Structures are given as structure tokens and as C-alpha cells.
């Protein structure tokens, strides 16, 4: 019943960033709007720098984040952090125990937070390998949300310039 709507630039940035990071895991923050209890809009993302610690709460550089968030405000992007994304190069979309810990930190800041996971190796033409998770409130610890993509008419026309003849 829950759905994460991912925008065009958000999806392209996450695929781009994941591929650029290979063979390492990368991570960043997702920006957007909690529309209602069953709906999260992800309108944009930004990359966090690689950290020696690997992907965890420690990787979140609060000085980088604050600077990036302030500068995005100045150019018209003042959306809430609605969660985080990270890459799993070659090994699919799920949360490890450390990922669950990271997500728990995000959930404590905002209980609506979403964890997106993308696989830049297994993502191929015709197959984007991505999933979105939240923690559950013998039970399993987390579950998967539907993902959909939102694009404007202007964005649709813009995307069609790739292979414009076709």
C-alpha cells in the first residue's frame, strides 16, 4: 500500500553515482516530501563523500550535509531529507545488519524515513535493480515498498532527445 515516487533526476543521480563508485558502496541523501502515510515523493538526491568507515551512520558528514543543504536552499531546493540511498555493487538490494542500524538512526530522526538500495552492476538496459525499505514497527526487521516514477510532461519531452530520431 506504500509507494516511493522517484523523480527523473533522483533516479539518474542514484544510477550515476552508484556506477561511478564501483567497486565500492556509495551513499547519499534523498530529498523530498512525505505526502501522506502511504506516499513519499523523492524529488532529488545528493551524494555523500566516500568515507574510510564504509557505509554507516559514521559516513554521514554533518558538515558536508549542512553546507550542501544550505546551498540547495539558496537555489530553490528546500525539501526535507526523506531518507537515504546506498549501492550494493553486484550483490542485490537488501539491508545488511549495519544497514538496518543506519536506517534505525534515520528512523529515530524521522519515523517516516526510507532506505533505497540500488545495484549498479546488475542494473542493465531493461532492468533497473532497485528497492525501497522501511523497518517493521519471531518478526522480520524490515519490508519493501512499491517504487514508481513521476515525470512531468516537460520532463518527458526532455528525456526523448536521447535517441531523438527513434
Amino acid at each position: 500500500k506504500e509507494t516511493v515516487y522517484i523523480s527523473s533526476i533522483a533516479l539518474l543521480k542514484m544510477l550515476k553515482h552508484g556506477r561511478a563508485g564501483v567497486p565500492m558502496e556509495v551513499m547519499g541523501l534523498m530529498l523530498g516530501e512525505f505526502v501522506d502515510d502511504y506516499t513519499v515523493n523523492v524529488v532529488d538526491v545528493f551524494a555523500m563523500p566516500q568515507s574510510g568507515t564504509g557505509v554507516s551512520v559514521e559516513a554521514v558528514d554533518d558538515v558536508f550535509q549542512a553546507k550542501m543543504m544550505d546551498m540547495l536552499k539558496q537555489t530553490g531546493r528546500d525539501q526535507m531529507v526523506v531518507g537515504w540511498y546506498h549501492s550494493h555493487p553486484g550483490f542485490g538490494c537488501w539491508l545488511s545488519s549495519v544497514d538496518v542500524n543506519t536506517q534505525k538512526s534515520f528512523e529515530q530522526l524521522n519515523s517516516r524515513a526510507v532506505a533505497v538500495v540500488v545495484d549498479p552492476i546488475q542494473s542493465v538496459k531493461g532492468k533497473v535493480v532497485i528497492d525501497a525499505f522501511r523497518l517493521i514497527d519471531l518478526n522480520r526487521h524490515y519490508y519493501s515498498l512499491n517504487i514508481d516514477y513521476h515525470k512531468t510532461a516537460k520532463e518527458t519531452k526532455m528525456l526523448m532527445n536521447l535517441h531523438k530520431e527513434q
Binding site: 527523473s8 550515476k16 563523500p49 532527445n161
Partner: protein, 174 residues
């Protein structure tokens, strides 16, 4: 001639310029302005990323405009921490056409680029016949003028996958 021959632009840049224009609620006759990133070290300049800039200009006077120099330096420094391969190679604006102040604005970006800066106009209104992009580098002729360079839209595999995924429902219909 040793001049750049052409320019390729990633779909992300087109969508980023449009998102910038929209999110700032830019209203005609005004334009949005930002930085482009990529690689300009060959005869093909590859434009692969971008970021928005705070920018203001005087309607009553083409000679009056302001760009935030500190914003350029501070954002670029964060961009470098994410991916040093994507260099600062020029600037963009939403046009749809070259404006009187552009050669002077271009002289500012010249202080930030290693290459002769590329100006990318992205026609976010998309009224043009062909590509919503026009590319220029400044050259001498004895005065400065913009040289028009041919553009194509091209994507690395990640983005190609992404774009195809985004246009899926449209493709089915058509």
C-alpha cells in the same frame, strides 16, 4: 584548426537545468544560470553534470548582473569530493537565446575553468525545432564573439538504462 569540434550533453544535465528553472519558479523574461561539469580536454567536450547558481540581473540594464563567486567555489569544492573526474568546464542558462551580457558573464567563468569556458544554453521551454541545446565557446574575430558548436545528446550506460526506464510507459503507448 585545433578548435573544439562538438559537444555531447547527458540527459541528466537537461533535466537538472529544467528542474532548476522550475523549482525557482523562474518567470519570463528571466532566466536561470548555473555551472556545467564534465570533460573538455579533447575536441569533443562532454557535459555530464551541473549545479544551479544564485544569479540576479537588472531588467532595465543588461550591464548589471551578479554572480555569487563564493557559491561557485564552495559548491565546486563539494563536487570535487564526490567525483574529481567531473571538472568545472563552463556554465549554462535557460535562454532561450544568447543575451547581451553573456560574453561578459563568460569572462567571469574563465577564472574558474581550465578550458576556454563552454556556454550551454538549455531551452527549458523546449520550443525549438531540434535539440533544446545550443553550445558556444568565445573566440576572437578583432573582437570577442561566440562560436556555435554542434551538440548531441548522449548517455553512459547507467543513464541510458535510467532514461529507458523512465520512458517505458510512453514507449508502450506509442
Amino acid at each position: 584548426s585545433l578548435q573544439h569540434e562538438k559537444v555531447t550533453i547527458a540527459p541528466l544535465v537537461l533535466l537538472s537545468a529544467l528542474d532548476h528553472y522550475e523549482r525557482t519558479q523562474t518567470k519570463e523574461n528571466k532566466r536561470c544560470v548555473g555551472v556545467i561539469l564534465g570533460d573538455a580536454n579533447s575536441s569533443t567536450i562532454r557535459v555530464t553534470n551541473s549545479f544551479a547558481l544564485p544569479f540576479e540581473e537588472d531588467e532595465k540594464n543588461s550591464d548589471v548582473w551578479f554572480l555569487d563567486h563564493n557559491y561557485i567555489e564552495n559548491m565546486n569544492e563539494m563536487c570535487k569530493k564526490i567525483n574529481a573526474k567531473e571538472k568545472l568546464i563552463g556554465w549554462y542558462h535557460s535562454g532561450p537565446k544568447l543575451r547581451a551580457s553573456d560574453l561578459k558573464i563568460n569572462e567571469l567563468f574563465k577564472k574558474y575553468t581550465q578550458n576556454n569556458p563552454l556556454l550551454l544554453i538549455v531551452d527549458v521551454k523546449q520550443q525549438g525545432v531540434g535539440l533544446p541545446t545550443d553550445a558556444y565557446v568565445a573566440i576572437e574575430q578583432t573582437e570577442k564573439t561566440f562560436l556555435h558548436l554542434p551538440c548531441t545528446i548522449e548517455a553512459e550506460e547507467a543513464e541510458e538504462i535510467g532514461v529507458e526506464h523512465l520512458l517505458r510507459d510512453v514507449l508502450e503507448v506509442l
